[PDB]
Design a protein around this ligand. Sequence first.
Ligand SMILES: [Mg+2]
Ligand SMILES: [Mg+2]
Ligand SMILES: [Mg+2]
Ligand SMILES: [Mg+2]
Ligand SMILES: [Mg+2]
Ligand SMILES: [Mg+2]
Ligand SMILES: [Mg+2]
Ligand SMILES: [Mg+2]
Ligand SMILES: [Mg+2]
Ligand SMILES: [Mg+2]
Ligand SMILES: [Mg+2]
Ligand SMILES: [Mg+2]
Ligand SMILES: [Mg+2]
Ligand SMILES: [Mg+2]
Ligand SMILES: [Mg+2]
Ligand SMILES: [Mg+2]
Ligand SMILES: [Mg+2]
Ligand SMILES: [Mg+2]
Ligand SMILES: [Mg+2]
Ligand SMILES: [Mg+2]
Ligand SMILES: [Mg+2]
Ligand SMILES: [Mg+2]
Ligand SMILES: [Mg+2]
Ligand SMILES: [Mg+2]
Ligand SMILES: [Mg+2]
Ligand SMILES: [Mg+2]
Ligand SMILES: [Mg+2]
Ligand SMILES: [Mg+2]
Ligand SMILES: [Mg+2]
Ligand SMILES: [Mg+2]
Ligand SMILES: [Mg+2]
Ligand SMILES: [Mg+2]
Lengths: 65, 144, 81, 61, 190, 142, 101
Amino acid sequence: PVNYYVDTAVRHVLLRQGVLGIKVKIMLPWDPTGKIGPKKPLPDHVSIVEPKDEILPTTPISEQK
Amino acid sequence: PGVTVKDVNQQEFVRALAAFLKKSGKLKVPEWVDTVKLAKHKELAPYDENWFYTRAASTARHLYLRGGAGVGSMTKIYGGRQRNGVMPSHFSRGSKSVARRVLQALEGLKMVEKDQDGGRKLTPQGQRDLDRIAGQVAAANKKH
Amino acid sequence: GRVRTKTVKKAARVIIEKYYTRLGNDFHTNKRVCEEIAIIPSKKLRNKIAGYVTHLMKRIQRGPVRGISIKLQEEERERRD
Amino acid sequence: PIKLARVTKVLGRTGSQGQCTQVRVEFMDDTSRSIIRNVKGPVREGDVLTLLESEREARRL
Amino acid sequence: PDIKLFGKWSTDDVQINDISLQDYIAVKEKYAKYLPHSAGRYAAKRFRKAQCPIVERLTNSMMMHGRNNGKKLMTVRIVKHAFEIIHLLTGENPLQVLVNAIINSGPREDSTRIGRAGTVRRQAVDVSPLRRVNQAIWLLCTGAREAAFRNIKTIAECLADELINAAKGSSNSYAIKKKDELERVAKSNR
Amino acid sequence: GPLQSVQVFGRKKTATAVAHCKRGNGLIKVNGRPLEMIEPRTLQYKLLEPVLLLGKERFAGVDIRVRVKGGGHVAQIYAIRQSISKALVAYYQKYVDEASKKEIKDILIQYDRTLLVADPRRCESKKFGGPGARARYQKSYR
Amino acid sequence: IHRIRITLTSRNVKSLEKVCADLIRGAKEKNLKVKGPVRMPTKTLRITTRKTPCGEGSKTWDRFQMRIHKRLIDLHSPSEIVKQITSISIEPGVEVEVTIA
RNA sequence: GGGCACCACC
RNA sequence: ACGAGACUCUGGCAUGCUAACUAGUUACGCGACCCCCGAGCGGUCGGCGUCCCCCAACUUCUUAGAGGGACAAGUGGCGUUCAGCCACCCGAGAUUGAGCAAUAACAGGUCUGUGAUGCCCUUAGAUGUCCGGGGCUGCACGCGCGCUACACUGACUGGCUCAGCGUGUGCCUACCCUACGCCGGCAGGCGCGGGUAACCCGUUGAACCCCAUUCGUGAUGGGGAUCGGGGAUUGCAAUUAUUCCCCAUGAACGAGGAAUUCCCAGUAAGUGCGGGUCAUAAGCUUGCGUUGAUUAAGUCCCUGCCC
Ligand SMILES: [Mg+2]
Ligand SMILES: [Mg+2]
Ligand SMILES: [Mg+2]
Ligand SMILES: [Mg+2]
Ligand SMILES: [Mg+2]
Ligand SMILES: [Mg+2]
Ligand SMILES: [Mg+2]
Ligand SMILES: [Mg+2]
Ligand SMILES: [Mg+2]
Ligand SMILES: [Mg+2]
Ligand SMILES: [Mg+2]
Ligand SMILES: [Mg+2]
Ligand SMILES: [Mg+2]
Ligand SMILES: [Mg+2]
Ligand SMILES: [Mg+2]
Ligand SMILES: [Mg+2]
Ligand SMILES: [Mg+2]
Ligand SMILES: [Mg+2]
Ligand SMILES: [Mg+2]
Ligand SMILES: [Mg+2]
Ligand SMILES: [Mg+2]
Ligand SMILES: [Mg+2]
Ligand SMILES: [Mg+2]
Ligand SMILES: [Mg+2]
Ligand SMILES: [Mg+2]
Ligand SMILES: [Mg+2]
Ligand SMILES: [Mg+2]
Ligand SMILES: [Mg+2]
Ligand SMILES: [Mg+2]
Ligand SMILES: [Mg+2]
Ligand SMILES: [Mg+2]
Ligand SMILES: [Mg+2]
């Protein structure tokens, strides 16, 4: 996941007394579309959906339509 | 109940075919057969003085099994390992002037002919001779 | 070793808490339910979660577990107690 | 005399490098008999050991 | 059908006289094979090599030294010739001779070392049956190997002589001498 | 006479042998050659094991032709054995009852499981820093 | 009516298979005869180098690898329809070559 | 005083 | 929360799916040869048709896509009966091998990889840059990584029979892989073709291994160092021998002291083959197959590192 979730950049800047080195790492957010982030999620993130409300059955009802 | 070449043992077949070629007496033998070794990785000349007939028989059998082989293919067939002093061994090919003369001598017997694609193959007469030799080998093996 | 990391255990416990009715003692039916309800981006992780869910369901059937508690189980224990 | 014994339970690993195994062995002639022995080599329960001298006993761990 | 090693040596008549080693020598009906070559996976799990036939174990242990590693067809041929020579010399089943040699060659009591690199002190211990079989096979192969070196005598003849002497119990064999010395040292380390 | 035949393969490290088994009189050949002419002849019994275990009676109604390729000599022999056994079992399954297949399969499996189930072992990759997969180059101090 | 061969070369398989599926669907929507796609063996270029810019330390090696995938499609059709279906096929990363045998 | 490792031993 | 796991590549299973003349199988025609005592619905064929006007089907074998499949799931024990461990059934598989890899540091290596770079030094009699010739390899002696051996489980001479990973005609840039025919005893030389590659080399006729022959415990037909005389290739140029070939010569070495290295299954070892370097070119390295084990399923005694 480092390959597609992390963006890295290394640069050099020449100042009066020598060279300084700059390293920047940015971790992209999860985006369902591929616009500003990876489409696929992190491998170990499991999202369990919340169950929907169900009406408790009381009496057998037959509906014809 | 017809015997073919693949049915019999190959070493006995080579021996019998070499004996047949020697007894025929129409094979042409180079003058330098007694002064040469068969490859550059060999140390000595062949022990058997009638080695030319054996090599011709082996070449005919190989052309029977896999036709269209040229001088380079025969050279690769008979190549072997070369030990060179204190250095590691390596694969080495045979002598081209022996393979070429064996093929030419077999063509002189009307047993080998030029292939259309390239190389040499067997004539129907050569195939007939090899099948007859195979039948003789099988009969000798079964009778004893 | 075959110890399960906390990811699998947490996912299995949450699945059992939320969907106790749909689960059972069968590994294959459990692994079919898990992909229906949960989002696991790996096949091996889904298999591990289902295999722990089956073990936990068997343990629950044997008796109460130190961790998760089912609403139906709590209501039944109220009648027991 | 030479005796034969049956390994009843494997106890542990002894030795400076752990080379020996401490086990409990019961004599074939007298099933009531049982001592503690040190064995060299892989040994499991049910093996038969040949005791050249059967009086010696080993200091268990 | 009847399965005979190399097509001529049967296994029904062979019997093992040691109760301890019965569970670790595989020569009997379900372990009867035509050749000592099976390409099996016996080293995958512990104690699994007790199910390997003993002839194949001898064949495996005969592929030494490093100039002979992996050459198992030559070893099978050597074993075949040695069995033929043993049958000619003794007149009995060479499988029985091999079983007797392995039974006699296995040390029964050993000495375990507690050594500060120079000086070593020892204490007598017992030997498990599996180690007895292993050490017997190793001793027999080593004796044959040392006999055949720098001598006009085939490795098969030396192996046959070593096996015959070990089965006979004679001290002319390498394995019997080694076993005797190991047991003497173990006795003195009690 | 319906044309009934089965082609089944067997494998060793890289060697693959495919056996075509059809209705016939008892012919069994490998690359056109008889079983007794395959080399090396040191391992000839390994090649005759299925026939000896099952007898010529069960092979007397089929013709089998094997084509081998890849690997070495020993691997090719061990592939040929498995191809022959599996081809006979698959033929009996389709064109004979299930009981005969069960008998043959039990007999073959009791003697050796590699007659019907392949060996998964393959060569391991070399790693830099040593001659092979596990061995390392000789270390030196001072 | 010409026998026309389309050769598709790519470095990733997802785009290559997407393009192949698009071409097959487009051609078969015109009631044409299509053979393939037949997949050639994958090519693997390897470069093994030392990690260190100098000659100091443990001898460690990088193993860089590039994979090339190749597909073939055969079509019995006139040139114009092939160019019609090909014009859409332009995709980033896939090299498409059309030849008339 | 414990734990681990064929770049430790057995 | 990072690291560990998860993840990616890889190796094993699919007669289930998708579909192939740059992969094949089977069948059917033509042809060659053998058996006229069984001549046949006979055997062998890497010999030719079967897609391209019309003259066969199908993916088992070969390639590579999509999916399945294994989770300590089932059983029996041992455990706080938990976390987990052992064994067994079924099963292709009940631990395949690598890649990536945290917080903190080292005056660790690299200015000789860079048109990365700060300061010094030099800059026309140059520390710039070309040309010619030498050196880096020089030998009383010590130390490492290795190759070949000390033989009969061998050497020699014949015969027979099996791989896999890969490369190949180049902006400058000259230098590619080679089938077949002839000449030479060999290194090689002439012709004439294919390949920018599942198409040609190539069915990559590899070596160990296997079957026969000779030798016979003799520093021997083991071993092949050091030297002499010839021949040929690469180059502008071969002497301080580039490499290769042929006759001849025939050293130490009979298994190695103190000490010490690597390794747990297709592994160690044996044996060859590709790539890098490469006008000429492997005793090195990095990969690939082939043959294929002994021993162990433990411990903290030595060494070392952590709590
Ligand atoms: Mg050869
Ligand atoms: Mg040599
Ligand atoms: Mg000898
Ligand atoms: Mg290997
Ligand atoms: Mg190796
Ligand atoms: Mg040691
Ligand atoms: Mg398939
Ligand atoms: Mg410093
Ligand atoms: Mg630098
Ligand atoms: Mg600089
Ligand atoms: Mg500077
Ligand atoms: Mg430098
Ligand atoms: Mg000049
Ligand atoms: Mg100069
Ligand atoms: Mg130098
Ligand atoms: Mg070094
Ligand atoms: Mg060395
Ligand atoms: Mg080396
Ligand atoms: Mg040999
Ligand atoms: Mg010699
Ligand atoms: Mg000779
Ligand atoms: Mg030879
Ligand atoms: Mg000499
Ligand atoms: Mg000599
Ligand atoms: Mg000269
Ligand atoms: Mg010089
Ligand atoms: Mg010479
Ligand atoms: Mg050390
Ligand atoms: Mg190499
Ligand atoms: Mg080179
Ligand atoms: Mg170098
Ligand atoms: Mg310690």
